Amino acid sequence: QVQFKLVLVGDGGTGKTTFVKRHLTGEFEKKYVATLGVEVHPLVFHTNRGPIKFNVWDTAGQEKFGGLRDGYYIQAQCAIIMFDVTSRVTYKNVPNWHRDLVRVCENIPIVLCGNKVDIKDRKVKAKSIVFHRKKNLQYYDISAKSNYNFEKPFLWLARKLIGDPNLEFVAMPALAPPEVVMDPALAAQAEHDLEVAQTTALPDEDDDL
Amino acid sequence: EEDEEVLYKVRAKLFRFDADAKEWKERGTGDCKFLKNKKTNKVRILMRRDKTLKICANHIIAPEYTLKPNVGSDRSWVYACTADIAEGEAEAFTFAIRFGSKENADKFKEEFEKAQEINKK
Amino acid sequence: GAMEGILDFSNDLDIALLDQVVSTFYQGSGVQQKQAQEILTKFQDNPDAWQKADQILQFSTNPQSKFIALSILDKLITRKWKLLPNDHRIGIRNFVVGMIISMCQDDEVFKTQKNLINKSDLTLVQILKQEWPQNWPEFIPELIGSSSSSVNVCENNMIVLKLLSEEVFDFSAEQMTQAKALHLKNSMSKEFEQIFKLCFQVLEQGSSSSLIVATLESLLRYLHWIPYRYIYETNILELLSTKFMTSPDTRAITLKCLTEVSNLKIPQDNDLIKRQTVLFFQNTLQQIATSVMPVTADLKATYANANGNDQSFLQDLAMFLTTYLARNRALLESDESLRELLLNAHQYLIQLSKIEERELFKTTLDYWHNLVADLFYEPLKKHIYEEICSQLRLVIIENMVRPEEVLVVENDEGEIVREFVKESDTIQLYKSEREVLVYLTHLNVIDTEEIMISKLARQIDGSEWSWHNINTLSWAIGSISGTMSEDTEKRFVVTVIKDLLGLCEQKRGKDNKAVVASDIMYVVGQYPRFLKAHWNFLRTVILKLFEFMHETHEGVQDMACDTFIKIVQKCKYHFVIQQPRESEPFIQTIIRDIQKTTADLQPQQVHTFYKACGIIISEERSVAERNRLLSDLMQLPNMAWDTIVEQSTANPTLLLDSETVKIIANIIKTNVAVCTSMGADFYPQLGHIYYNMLQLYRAVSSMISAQVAAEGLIATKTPKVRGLRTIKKEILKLVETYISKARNLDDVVKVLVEPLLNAVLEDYMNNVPDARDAEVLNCMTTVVEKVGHMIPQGVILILQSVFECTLDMINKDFTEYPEHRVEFYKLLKVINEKSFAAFLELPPAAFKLFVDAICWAFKHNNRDVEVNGLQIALDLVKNIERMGNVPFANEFHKNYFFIFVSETFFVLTDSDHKSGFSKQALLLMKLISLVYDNKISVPLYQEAEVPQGTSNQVYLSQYLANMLSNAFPHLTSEQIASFLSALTKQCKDLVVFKGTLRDFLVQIKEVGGDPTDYLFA
């Protein structure tokens, strides 16, 4: 199993950590808890050329929490630059993040992602987004919330890193599940948790699913 | 999955309850499938996420389990599971599963129970 | 553990330990990696860590440790450099320079430590920004000299120069004062003759070395700013366009250089420079044809294969061709000897436009728009491009993406479903494709029609039948509506509809009929002109839409309803009238058939259907017939409403029934839907339900409150309460919808307003936070917006009910109750505009909370809130000023002027509210200009804190000097004094004022900023 270092950069609040957490656990984190320096998370995808592992270096976007800053970029083999289509400032900062990034990583595949395209009042419109053209970056509109194009950045990078343009994600194998008998020595806490779970409302009851 | 029969397929969103955080966290959206192993006649829930196709549910539909309503929803079930192997080593979870419709949720409950009767034999 | 020792600075730095911490961080994993991270971050942030840098650079075995030592120095150089005494600055300069030199002269280090060397060069450039040329006048000459004796040092000096150009010209605008950017630009400009000479020599004397590549990379940055004579009056153009295009080592960078050259500022009058602009293009295209690929090459397949750098090369070729041709193609259009070159270049773009890659396709499509727009207006040009345009018609017709209206899509399993999400990117791409194809159709309507008709023929016979191909064709057919003559359109549209209806009957299964149905619906919805003239077809179209409303695919049903809306908003007149050959107006037969037309529609589709009927009914201008047509439309909802009003007032126990709330919700949604399209004409129908609707609002409100009491807050999440609240929200939506479009404002004030306010205001005020509907505030905003001026007491009442209680919900944090937050400041905005008197009648303590609420809004990063907060401040200041010299305004300025000034300064300067800079600046300008123009009649100072005669001007300066001195103690009194002097003189000149604010924001991030920078303007 070959692994690749991925660095994720962009302004604070653009959705970098949310995007990564969606891919790690399936969840949608609604709160904004600013990253401090960097959080490193392994992320594997199964493909028709075997598993590919990304070591995702999810960096801080707030200057005051920047930590090592460009120090995080050393030996990155790919990157994602993130901005927020509801915040023009975050797009105007894309050339700055790109500059800092390519000075350390001169020849890596890079995806530019405009996040939050689910929001109706969009400020950075499709026709304004052209910075990727001269810099040879792939671009995708994404949303961590609706999951629109959420797999594309990793899929494109995997194709570039492996050097195979017909690479596809594939259904991971499904091992037969066990038949674990319930043990009353932790039943009380298991049914304490169940009744609490029943009386906690599910989030986003107005969604389609 | 190719020595298993698809007894039932439905589009759904799966949650797990985080006890420390006290909040429901989404785990995956996609086709929830009931798969009956043709050799053992044992029916499992298998569910994969859209696009990545990563497993978000993989457990036997145990006879002991009971689907229960969630206070917020007419189109969801909550139940305890003692051994799911989606993310690898067997863990226990309190799952919730939401469907697009109350009729889908009712249909799911019928099928979940029929699969339970099958697993008793 | 052991790793934390490097943070103890009392001891000497264990260098080997640092290197273990660094390699644990970079090469480790898990808890150890994250532990090392936190330690390394603390080490770097220690304000004395730079003193250890020299030591790390000399003694460490780990290149990453040295990188981090330079990061520490970088931070010191850019932020605190000017506090250091000369000896330290010169010292740090010396060991950075010395290290770079010694790294370059060891040939193994030069190969293997590229990251470290580039980082040292950047660090050197940061020193240059502080020191050069005023305290380092010899740098460029000494750089030029040291390049001659070592090719590694020469190559590395191209990198230093590249970085220097970038920092001075490309990234100076945000990071330096205007004065300092101007000073460094002037400095680089004066020394450039010498820099270019070195650069030019290197390019002549070498083929495709790493030295050549680095030199060309430096040239790319110089081309952003250098005078054009360096490109056109030397041999550089010939070298770029021939020699450096042949070698694949230099090709990519050269091609980017040539793209920038195609944007240099040039003479328009000079025939020789035009010949040189032509020649470099001729040369480049020649090298491409003979060294890389011929004009006929399948670039689609080449790009798909993704060998080496082919994708990046084809992207760069696209950028070069489009950049050059958009500026210079007229140079190739007249001379017959340049025709082949013009057309081959465009033929390359045709081939590039077939590539399967959306972003590249958008890039070439932008150029095609530029071309075809020019050919549409420029005389005697279109004939040149006839064969190119013909090929382009094919490319676009075959690569049309899905328009917004088409609700059926092909998923991954291979099935047809309703679309989950709107694709805003593909919608925009559809529109860009439409613009080009519309232009192309005008340029040759015969060619376009022939292409489309023969493609349709090969969908009939099945020789090219597919979902993709019927779709792209149908979308293209729809996109060109308005390009053909009425007669040509008649025969065309009838032909395609007939042929598509034939396909809809032939093909098997429910997937194929959903596809063809969506295509039929898209086409007919795009050609309203045709349908208006041909009632026969219009009627059949509509009853076909009604037929699609019975299909089992919900997407087909949804699209029928939207297509019905779309046709109806253009053809409504042809429904309102009784046409020839007809027993009745088609409106009236639609209305009586509603029950059975909409039987298999789900509620949301039914509401759209009713809204469409509303559009039709509003075409009828005779008041009597419209009011009746409205009555006829609403009978099914009014009968359900009339039988449900009697049961729920005969016993309030029946509204418990969850099935009953669903019917009530849908009755009000139907009224909302119709009121949306009818506006002021809806009044009769509203007046029928209004009093009973508002009683139902109260009845529903009681049960929500009772359920919360009995069940707790968790009741607000239950299906039952959510259903009950849906009724309240929809009632509010209906009243808001009506009042927004209302044309009898006397009726609104006299009939609607008083019962609305009695029904909603105290219910909102007296519910617990989680039970309050934000839609109440939204509703009141429209009420104040439209009739606020007619109900001064009603507005006072609105404030009293919602102001303090809503503020209390939203002033603990920035996150909680997001929709209340947004609707709250929208409400206060409109009250402050339209009925400012209401705020004059607030008691002094409540007015103080108004000011607190406004300043609270400034501090939001939520732009819905932020923008309204700053607008309110600006309108408020303007309202106060209009009152003149009276006690309220005099009191306002003494209590709140400096509060507004310092709160505006806080958000300007804290780096966490950059999105509102322009509005913040405008507000600050207004406040300062009030004092500068003496529009504040009273002293802002307290009596006996300054001399008696002293003006508000003098006091304003002292207050602000003091405020800034304490908030930014690292600024000198002089910096502060010059900043405020400049800011006060520039308070009528927004763009300059903003520049001075920007300069200040740079200076607060460093020590030792020059006070004379503020004299820039």
Ligand SMILES: Nc1nc2c(ncn2[C@@H]2O[C@H](COP(=O)(O)OP(=O)(O)OP(=O)(O)O)[C@@H](O)[C@H]2O)c(=O)[nH]1
């Ligand atoms: N509507 C919407 N919200 C999103 C989306 N992605 C993220 N968010 C929200 O925006 C905020 C972004 O949070 P983070 O992911 O922590 O931001 P970040 O880029 O990691 O910020 P730093 O760690 O400070 O650099 C959170 O409140 C998310 O819930 C999206 O696609 N749509």
Ligand SMILES: [Cl-]
């Ligand atoms: Cl914005």
Ligand SMILES: [Cl-]
């Ligand atoms: Cl959207």
Ligand SMILES: [Cl-]
């Ligand atoms: Cl390094």
Ligand SMILES: [Cl-]
């Ligand atoms: Cl010259």
Ligand SMILES: [Cl-]
């Ligand atoms: Cl009309």
Ligand SMILES: [Cl-]
């Ligand atoms: Cl001073």
Ligand SMILES: [Cl-]
């Ligand atoms: Cl500072």
Ligand SMILES: [Mg+2]
């Ligand atoms: Mg983060």
